[PDB]
Design a binder for this molecule. Structure first.
Ligand SMILES: Nc1ncnc2c1ncn2[C@@H]1O[C@H](COP(=O)(O)OP(=O)(O)OP(O)(O)=S)[C@@H](O)[C@H]1O
Ligand SMILES: Nc1ncnc2c1ncn2[C@@H]1O[C@H](COP(=O)(O)OP(=O)(O)OP(O)(O)=S)[C@@H](O)[C@H]1O
Ligand SMILES: [Mg+2]
Ligand SMILES: [Mg+2]
Lengths: 333, 223
DNA sequence: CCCCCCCCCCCCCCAAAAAAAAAAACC
């Protein structure tokens, strides 16, 4: 009796909302395909496992922060490279004014199709992001350092002049404006951030990021990247031993971590990861310092094992196949 | 939480504000009540909602383009008499239409605070008649310069503090570990405002990732 | 029977927003 009157009042209101605002303005969550989480590869297999859903989520904001020369630009370019191989359009907003195009090419970026901008102000940087996001034609946008997003009042002013919370206010306003445009267009926005010190603070970690508190709330993923050591060919330092900690995650469980190598002029060592995951999943046998695949001695030392997997593409296809099928916790489709 | 009233849940990032409001919805759906989620942040995962026990197929959802549209849908569902619980995920993301149409850098002094002041006036009465519970999630921001009181603020001006019948401050106070694997969060909720009973009481519980609030953990501690 | 003539005066505000950054040996 009342069931029916409530169902009619509901149907009428849903009708009036859809009339006033448009077709998909309100609906049942179970029948809204828009709100399914789609992902892209990061270029690292250990990071795709740590993210739980197999990569970074489309239509969302991501933050990548860390100390000096930890691999923040290298990691974001490998994301772009992987997205371009899947026929997506990418854009780089270079507020730091420090991108080497030859090095981007060596990491596998198609630089003749990468949109690049070196904007004068933080307001111009963020207005280009909103213009590209509304277009529906760009899939991935990277903004290199939040720290270099200078407000126009600060650019026009003198050195020593105080601009209290002006950049924090610009970042608050930009998040409000962008979150909805990105979700509609299904665009991924990645912010890189630098670290600074808080002083006068309680016993919590004194490390902070720039541009205030808004971005911490609006980000669906936050990644802390750190150089934890060196990779040596005898004496020559040839690369960096890297750790990525997942510090926030809204698409899967957080506080997982990834270890991988960045090799100078190649990027992320994909086969180096595929060894370590083949070991952990009992598909490669490491007897002391002798790696073995089904009895066959693939090599001695991780570098020789990696070199073996390079010249056997069939064995690398097979191990990738299994590791993918086993270890991904939240596969989408 | 009282029916026909406004509730505010605020706290820092990844403190459990969305998880908490989905467990309210879940519990209400089990007592045959209709619920709605206005997702202004554009950051709800339907699979995670299903794992906390929400019936996804009966949960009304909206991802509104403006703050005005979001609050017009709240007033439309309030007047219907058909919806029992509404959640508005983040007051912070309720952007005025002028700010959306405008450029980044443009000043809109107290435009969001005005919208929120106007919204409360309109909503308070409509919610009481319908016996509808409205829950506002809020983010924290820092007050700077010459400060009278604590420098932690909430977004969207001063109206919502007055109109709210309950205000909850939620915080993550530590990790829950299965040896090495971090499997959940130790949580604290302070009742900072209460009009339906005495305030300043607090609750401590565990949020386990993929399950939600650990009911049996609470039952030990209360036992 | 016959024919119209002319204007007068204002009234009330509404709402916050946001961090930034190390410095230094001592025997
Ligand atoms: N053009 C290049 N050629 C060779 N090695 C490079 C080049 N650019 C960067 N690297 C190295 O790659 C590693 C990671 O560099 P990036 O990815 O540029 O780190 P980053 O965190 O962006 O550091 P910033 O922006 O300079 S604080 C470092 O050890 C660099 O020296
Ligand atoms: N989809 C998910 N799967 C597993 N764990 C999750 C998921 N979403 C959130 N969590 C975890 O549950 C805890 C509380 O998350 P939320 O309920 O999203 O908190 P919140 O205050 O809404 O944070 P925001 O909106 O991102 S500032 C966090 O430690 C999350 O990492
Ligand atoms: Mg860089
Ligand atoms: Mg939330």
């Amino acid at each position: 009796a009342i069931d029916e009157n409530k169902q009619k009042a509901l149907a009428a209101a849903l009708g009036q909302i859809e009339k006033q605002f448009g077709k998909g303005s309100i609906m049942r969550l179970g029948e809204d395909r828009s709100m399914d989480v789609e992902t892209i590869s990061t270029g690292s297999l250990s990071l795709d496992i740590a993210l739980g859903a197999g990569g970074l989520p489309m239509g969302r904001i991501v933050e990548i922060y860390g100390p000096e020369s930890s691999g923040k630009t290298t990691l974001t370019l490998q994301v772009i490279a992987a997205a371009q191989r899947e026929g997506k359009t990418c854009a780089f907003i270079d507020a730091e004014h420090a991108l080497d195009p030859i090095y981007a090419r060596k990491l596998g970026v198609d630089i003749d199709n990468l949109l690049c901008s070196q904007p004068d102000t933080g307001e111009q940087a963020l207005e280009i992001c909103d213009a590209l996001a509304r277009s529906g034609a760009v899939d991935v946008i990277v903004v290199d350092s939040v720290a270099a997003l200078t407000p126009k009042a600060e650019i026009e002013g003198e050195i020593g002049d105080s601009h209290m919370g002006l950049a924090a206010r610009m970042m608050s306003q930009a998040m409000r404006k962008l979150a909805g445009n990105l979700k509609q267009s299904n665009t991924l926005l990645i912010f890189i951030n630098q670290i600074r010190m808080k002083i006068g603070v309680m016993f919590g970690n004194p490390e902070t990021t720039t541009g205030g508190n808004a971005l911490k709330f609006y980000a669906s993923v936050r990644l802390d990247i750190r150089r934890i050591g060196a990779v040596k060919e005898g004496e020559n330092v040839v690369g960096s031993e890297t750790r990525v900690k997942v510090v926030k995650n809204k698409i899967a469980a957080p506080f997982k971590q990834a270890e991988f190598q960045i090799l100078y002029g190649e990027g992320i060592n994909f086969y180096g990861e595929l060894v370590d995951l083949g070991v952990k999943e009992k598909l490669i046998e490491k007897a002391g310092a002798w790696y073995s695949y089904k009895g066959e001695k693939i090599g001695q030392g991780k570098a020789n094992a990696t070199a073996w997997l390079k010249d056997n593409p069939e064995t690398a296809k097979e191990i990738e196949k299994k590791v993918r099928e086993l270890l991904l916790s939240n596969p989408n489709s």
